[PDB]
Amino acid sequence: GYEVHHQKLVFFAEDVGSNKGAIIGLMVGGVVIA
Amino acid sequence: GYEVHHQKLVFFAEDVGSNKGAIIGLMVGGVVIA
Amino acid sequence: GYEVHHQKLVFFAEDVGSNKGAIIGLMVGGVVIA
Amino acid sequence: GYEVHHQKLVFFAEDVGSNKGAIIGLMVGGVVIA
Amino acid sequence: GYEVHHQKLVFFAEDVGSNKGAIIGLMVGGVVIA
Amino acid sequence: GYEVHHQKLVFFAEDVGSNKGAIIGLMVGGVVIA
Amino acid sequence: VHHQKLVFFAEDVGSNKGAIIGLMVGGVVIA
Amino acid sequence: VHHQKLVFFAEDVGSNKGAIIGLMVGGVVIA
Amino acid sequence: VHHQKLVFFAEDVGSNKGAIIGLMVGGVVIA
C-alpha cells in the first residue's frame, strides 16, 4: 500500500498578494521591460 | 492499494490578491512592457 | 484499488480578487503594454 | 514601435501524426486508461 | 523599437509522431494508467 | 533597440517520436501507472 | 509446400488498431 | 516444407495496437 | 524444415503495443 498527502506548490503568494509589474510563469524569449 | 489527497498548486494568490500590471501564465516571445 | 481527492489548482485568486491590468492564462507572441 | 512574428506553439506533432490512445489538453479530474 | 521572431514551444514531437498511450498537457488529479 | 529570435523549448522530441505510456506536462496529484 | 493457420486466435479478440498479417512477401503496410 | 500454427493465442486478446505478423519475408510493416 | 507452434500463449493477453512475430526472414518491422 501507499499514501501521499498534504503537498503544496506556491508561486509568489499563499495568503496576501499584490503586484505592480510583470509576473511570467514561463517564457521563451521576449523583452520584459517591466 | 493507493491513496493521494490534499494536493494544491497556487499561482499569485490563495486568499486575497490585487493587481496593477501583467500576469502571464505562459508565453512564447512578446514584449510585456507592464 | 485507487483513490484521489481534494486536489486543487488556483490561478491569481481563490476567495477575493480585484484587477486593473492584464491577466493572460496562455499567450503566443504579442505586446501587452498593460 | 514593436514587432512580433513567426511564433508557434505545437502541441503534439505539427505534421503527419498517428494516434491510438487518449490525448488531453487539460483535465481537472478523471481516470484515463490508455 | 523592439523585435521578437522565430520563437517556438514544441510539446511532443513537431514532426511525424506515433502515440499509443496517454498524453496530458495539464492534470489537476486522476489516475492515468497507460 | 532590442532583438530576440530563434529561441526554442522542446519538451519531448521535436522529431519522429513514438510513445507507449504516460506523458504529463504538469500534474498536481494522482497515480500514474505507466 | 503446405500451410495451415499461420496466425490463429482461439477466443475473443476485444479490438484491433493495427496490422494482423498472416504472411508478408513484399510491399508497404502502414497500419 | 510444412508450416502449422506459427503464432497461436489460446485465450482472450484485450486489444491490439501493433503488428502481429505470422511470417515475414520482405517489405516494410509500419505498425 | 518442419515448423509447428513457434510462438504460443496459454492465458489472456491484456494488450499489445509492439511486434509479436512468429518468424523473420527479411524486411523491416517498425512496431
CSV table of N, CA and C in Angstrom, one decimal, chain E residues 5 9-11 13-15 17-21 23 25 30-31 33-34:
chain,number,residue,atom,x,y,z
E,5,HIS,N,11.0,37.3,-32.9
E,5,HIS,CA,10.6,36.5,-34.0
E,5,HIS,C,11.2,35.1,-33.9
E,9,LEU,N,7.5,26.6,-29.2
E,9,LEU,CA,7.3,25.8,-28.0
E,9,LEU,C,6.7,24.5,-28.5
E,10,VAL,N,7.6,23.5,-28.6
E,10,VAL,CA,7.2,22.2,-29.2
E,10,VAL,C,7.0,21.2,-28.0
E,11,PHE,N,5.8,20.9,-27.6
E,11,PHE,CA,5.4,19.8,-26.7
E,11,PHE,C,5.2,18.6,-27.6
E,13,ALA,N,7.1,16.5,-30.1
E,13,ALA,CA,7.4,16.0,-31.5
E,13,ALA,C,6.7,16.8,-32.6
E,14,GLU,N,7.3,17.9,-33.0
E,14,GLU,CA,6.8,18.7,-34.1
E,14,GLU,C,7.2,18.1,-35.4
E,15,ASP,N,6.9,16.8,-35.6
E,15,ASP,CA,7.0,16.0,-36.8
E,15,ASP,C,6.2,14.7,-36.7
E,17,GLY,N,4.8,11.7,-35.4
E,17,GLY,CA,4.9,11.2,-34.1
E,17,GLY,C,3.7,10.2,-33.8
E,18,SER,N,4.0,9.0,-33.6
E,18,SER,CA,3.0,8.0,-33.2
E,18,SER,C,2.6,8.3,-31.8
E,19,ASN,N,1.6,7.5,-31.3
E,19,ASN,CA,1.1,7.6,-29.9
E,19,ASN,C,0.2,6.4,-29.6
E,20,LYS,N,0.6,5.6,-28.7
E,20,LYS,CA,-0.3,4.6,-28.1
E,20,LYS,C,-0.2,4.7,-26.6
E,21,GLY,N,-1.0,5.5,-26.0
E,21,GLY,CA,-1.0,5.8,-24.6
E,21,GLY,C,-1.3,7.2,-24.3
E,23,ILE,N,-1.4,11.1,-23.2
E,23,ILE,CA,-0.6,12.3,-23.2
E,23,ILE,C,-1.5,13.4,-22.6
E,25,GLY,N,-1.6,17.5,-21.1
E,25,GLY,CA,-0.9,18.8,-21.0
E,25,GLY,C,-1.0,19.4,-19.6
E,30,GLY,N,-6.4,12.6,-10.8
E,30,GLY,CA,-6.9,11.5,-11.5
E,30,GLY,C,-6.0,10.3,-11.4
E,31,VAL,N,-6.2,9.4,-12.3
E,31,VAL,CA,-5.4,8.1,-12.4
E,31,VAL,C,-5.2,7.8,-13.8
E,33,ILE,N,-3.5,5.4,-16.3
E,33,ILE,CA,-2.9,4.0,-16.4
E,33,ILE,C,-2.6,3.8,-17.9
E,34,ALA,N,-1.4,4.1,-18.3
E,34,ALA,CA,-1.0,3.9,-19.6
E,34,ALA,C,-0.7,2.5,-20.0
